[PDB]
Design a protein around this ligand. Structure first.
Ligand SMILES: *[B-](O)(O)CNC(=O)c1ccccc1[N+](=O)[O-]
Ligand SMILES: *[B-](O)(O)CNC(=O)c1ccccc1[N+](=O)[O-]
Ligand SMILES: [Cl-]
Ligand SMILES: [Cl-]
Ligand SMILES: [Cl-]
Ligand SMILES: [Cl-]
Ligand SMILES: [Cl-]
Ligand SMILES: [Cl-]
Ligand SMILES: [Cl-]
Ligand SMILES: [Cl-]
Ligand SMILES: [Cl-]
Ligand SMILES: [Cl-]
Ligand SMILES: [Cl-]
Ligand SMILES: [Cl-]
Ligand SMILES: [Cl-]
Ligand SMILES: [Cl-]
Ligand SMILES: [Cl-]
Ligand SMILES: [Cl-]
Ligand SMILES: [Cl-]
Ligand SMILES: [Cl-]
Ligand SMILES: [Cl-]
Ligand SMILES: [Cl-]
Ligand SMILES: [Cl-]
Ligand code: NA
Ligand code: NA
Lengths: 467, 467
């Protein structure tokens, strides 16, 4: 008889979400093993009838064989996550109908998936929202595709200034954020805390202009994005991801820039000990350690500021000692409020969370800010109660390679003379330390100091800076 | 033997905070009774030696007599409040040393005090911070002394506009709020949610200019304020109150405008049944029902907006069914962050809370916003767990007498022609319903539409309104 086991070898089942998810993945690994065993070439494998035969064969091989499939699942943790969604999932319901949910808890150092939530209740809806369903990651794209890459390329530092002035998509329509057409210049911190859209748009346009291999970064984390030539890319337009895959991007940032491929199956053995399949770690330095650790600091204040999520308040009340762990994270919201995300990490773990409706109709305006935050606070509490040391008490910290520059708070660049139609002008004023991931740190203030901005924009900004 | 009892007649003690507080008040009532019994005149009562004699006599009378002193205290509730501060008071400590605390829970319909917190731990510090210590109520003054009176006098409605532009105290110093010297025009809702200072300053100046009997309102609620001629009065300057007294002001607003005097002793009887003392209700309509119910709606969004307090997030996580009760409230913060307040009500109850240091040194910047909010969320949860129906599920609602006007969102006044140096101008634009407590509702827009503002201010505002 074949068995699926938890990571400690305790049997899950002989051959709900846990069962079908782990069995499905194991059948895929058995497929690969059986095709290679029978000497089926890649070309023969392209044949649809051969594929169907080998997929059925892999299913039956497990049913009838005596294979031992070792999963990465932690029994206590995954059980506590099921209880949490059963008891607390109703907190998601926001008057837009029954709200669905997916979560994945991942070991930052290995990519192992310790536990997950596939949905509100398998018996009523079997769609697996942790592993199968793909939805836009919305503004949780921004740290990975826009800001993180710009920092890694030395095009941006932690206190760099960006334009949030009103600007239009190429087609003439305003770039919106809730009901605002934008404001003025702002720091990266403020752009991220609030999740403004315009600054991310200009950052991705700056990457394009510098011919940065953005696809290179993303594919190193296993993202598949069919088209990079999309204005709204850094806000999640043109991207659709599973919670498991997206959790892996945030694993990369939390793990000081080093990607480990997500997995739920670690090994499959025949009864006699032959290894059919074994996971093989292939670590990749996707962002420099400087860049990742700079981003950690920014995503810490995303949660602390409480601007787009109540999570820290919710978790402080439920478990104040766990709230004092070093949480960092980012929210995501789609344009019609169709998908909400909250991605959380401590140095040890990352927990991804999505909520939404299976038919894509809109959630309430505050579903991500309050409901999903409160739910994920209960879920994080449940995980900790079931495994008290799992989140860990380590702090994220700036890598020694980070370059620290003194820059004007107004310009996010080093003080000095600047040309402002006429008066070549001594740029003075209060300063701040800005973190960079290049060799030389911040440049001298230049007239076009911000990421993005129109001529009129700069005239207004500099006007303001003068007095 | 004399006994002090809970409201249901269960004995507290024969003759911690509960004991000393109730005994002290009972000794004061016995003093009054014994002086009147012995036919001591008011003039003889002014004699310091006679007073000392009669206070000692009242103490001994209780010690030796067989009096039954009935308190308003609810045993389960008050016990749960003690357990809460014992278990959760450490959540107040914010790195400025040991933080003290006072709370009073009051029945809105009667003024009865059902329970209270006198401090972190009687055995270590006996100061009674619920009944005895007096501190500035800071910005929790604003609803009572400024906005509530202005509304009640028909000088303001729920969507009235106020100046938050920079302005100075008479002595030249800027009126500050945290580190801001002010912004621009704003609605009453936004002034209250954020607790801006300048708008409250101008509202109290407008009351002065209209010769409003502000002292009349305040003394009807039992406040003693020695000097009304203070610019910072509506921000709590020149006022010092006990938590018990201040809870009574918020009781008045919650009780649709009707004050009931706070009390902890309801009756004292000799052993043979003679009534030495009995509380006598003397209800007073301090604000019209219109005004109070308009204020309830505004203080509901103070908590909902979560701008100056995380309370709603904290309580949603601890007890989401109780968080769905109809909470309204207001925070207070002193200038050096010396005192933080959070006043909470449902239609049934009000709970006052102060925290601070006995020597008045500063708390952390977020002590009121986060620490005291989280603590009071646990305290409200503890009260409900001990008496499940005590907070009640009733909603606050606008009294039928409220006048509803359609007013410009920009002016907070009715649309129409206005004089703006030159072009007599048709004032158009998006509108909103504003609530008033007078007969005629909102006036027609006039040039000086806002509460307060300088000439330059209005030129800027109208400039902006034009385009
Ligand atoms: B974020 O706070 O969720 C903001 N993101 C968006 O507005 C977004 C979401 C998904 C696709 C596109 C898009 N756009 O800025 O256009
Ligand atoms: B409120 O949000 O606490 C603002 N209040 C104050 O600034 C205040 C507190 C106490 C006394 C005076 C004062 N002033 O505005 O000057
Ligand atoms: Cl499951
Ligand atoms: Cl568009
Ligand atoms: Cl690319
Ligand atoms: Cl993908
Ligand atoms: Cl491209
Ligand atoms: Cl896998
Ligand atoms: Cl075998
Ligand atoms: Cl925090
Ligand atoms: Cl919050
Ligand atoms: Cl420098
Ligand atoms: Cl460099
Ligand atoms: Cl006590
Ligand atoms: Cl002053
Ligand atoms: Cl007066
Ligand atoms: Cl007083
Ligand atoms: Cl006066
Ligand atoms: Cl009393
Ligand atoms: Cl008697
Ligand atoms: Cl709320
Ligand atoms: Cl009207
Ligand atoms: Cl009138
Ligand atoms: Na967001
Ligand atoms: Na305040």
């Amino acid at each position: 008889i074949s068995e699926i086991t938890y990571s400690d070898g305790t049997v899950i089942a002989s051959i709900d979400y846990l069962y079908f998810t782990t069995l499905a993945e194991a059948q895929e690994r058995m497929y690969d093993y059986l095709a290679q065993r029978d000497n089926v070439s890649a070309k023969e494998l392209k044949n649809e009838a051969t594929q169907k035969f080998y997929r059925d064969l892999a299913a039956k091989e497990i049913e009838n064989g005596g294979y031992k499939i070792t999963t990465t699942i932690d029994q206590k943790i995954h059980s506590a996550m099921q209880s949490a969604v059963a008891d607390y999932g109703y907190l998601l319901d926001d008057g837009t109908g029954r709200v669905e949910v997916g979560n994945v808890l991942m070991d930052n150092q290995t990519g192992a998936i310790l536990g997950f939530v596939g949905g509100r209740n398998y018996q009523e809806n079997q769609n697996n929202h942790a592993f199968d369903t793909k939805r836009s990651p919305a503004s949780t794209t921004k740290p990975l595709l826009a800001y993180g890459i710009a920092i890694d390329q030395g095009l941006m530092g932690s206190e760099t200034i960006l334009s949030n002035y009103p600007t239009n998509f190429a087609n003439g329509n305003p770039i919106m954020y809730a009901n605002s057409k934008g404001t003025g210049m702002m720091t990266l911190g403020e752009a991220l805390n609030y999740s403004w859209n315009i600054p991310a748009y200009w950052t991705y346009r700056m990457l394009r202009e510098n011919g940065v291999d953005v696809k290179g970064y993303m594919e190193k984390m296993g993202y598949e994005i069919p088209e990079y030539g999309i204005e709204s890319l850094p806000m999640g337009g043109g991207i659709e991801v599973t919670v498991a895959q997206h959790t892996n991007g945030y694993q990369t940032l939390a793990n000081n820039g080093v990607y480990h491929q997500k997995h739920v199956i670690s090994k499959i053995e025949a009864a006699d000990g032959r290894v059919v399949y074994e996971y093989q770690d292939k670590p990749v330095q996707v962002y420099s350690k400087a860049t990742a650790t700079i981003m950690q600091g920014l995503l810490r204040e995303v949660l602390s500021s409480r601007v787009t999520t109540t999570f820290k308040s919710n978790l402080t009340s439920l478990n104040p000692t766990l709230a004092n762990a070093d949480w960092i994270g980012k929210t995501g919201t789609t344009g019609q409020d169709e998908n909400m995300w909250l991605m959380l990490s401590t140095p040890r773990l990352t927990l991804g969370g999505w909520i939404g409706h299976d038919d894509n109709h809109s959630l309430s305006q505050q579903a991500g800010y309050s409901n999903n935050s409160n739910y994920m606070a209960h879920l994080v509490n449940a995980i900790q109660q079931a495994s008290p040391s799992i989140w860990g008490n380590e702090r994220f910290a700036l890598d020694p390679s980070v370059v620290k520059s003194e820059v004007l708070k107004s310009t996010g660049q080093k003080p000095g003379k600047v040309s402002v139609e006429g008066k070549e002008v001594e740029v003075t004023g209060s300063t701040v330390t800005s973190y960079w991931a290049n060799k030389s740190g911040a440049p001298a203030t230049s007239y076009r100091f911000a990421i993005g901005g129109s001529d009129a924009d700069y005239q207004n900004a500099w006007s303001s800076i003068v007095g």
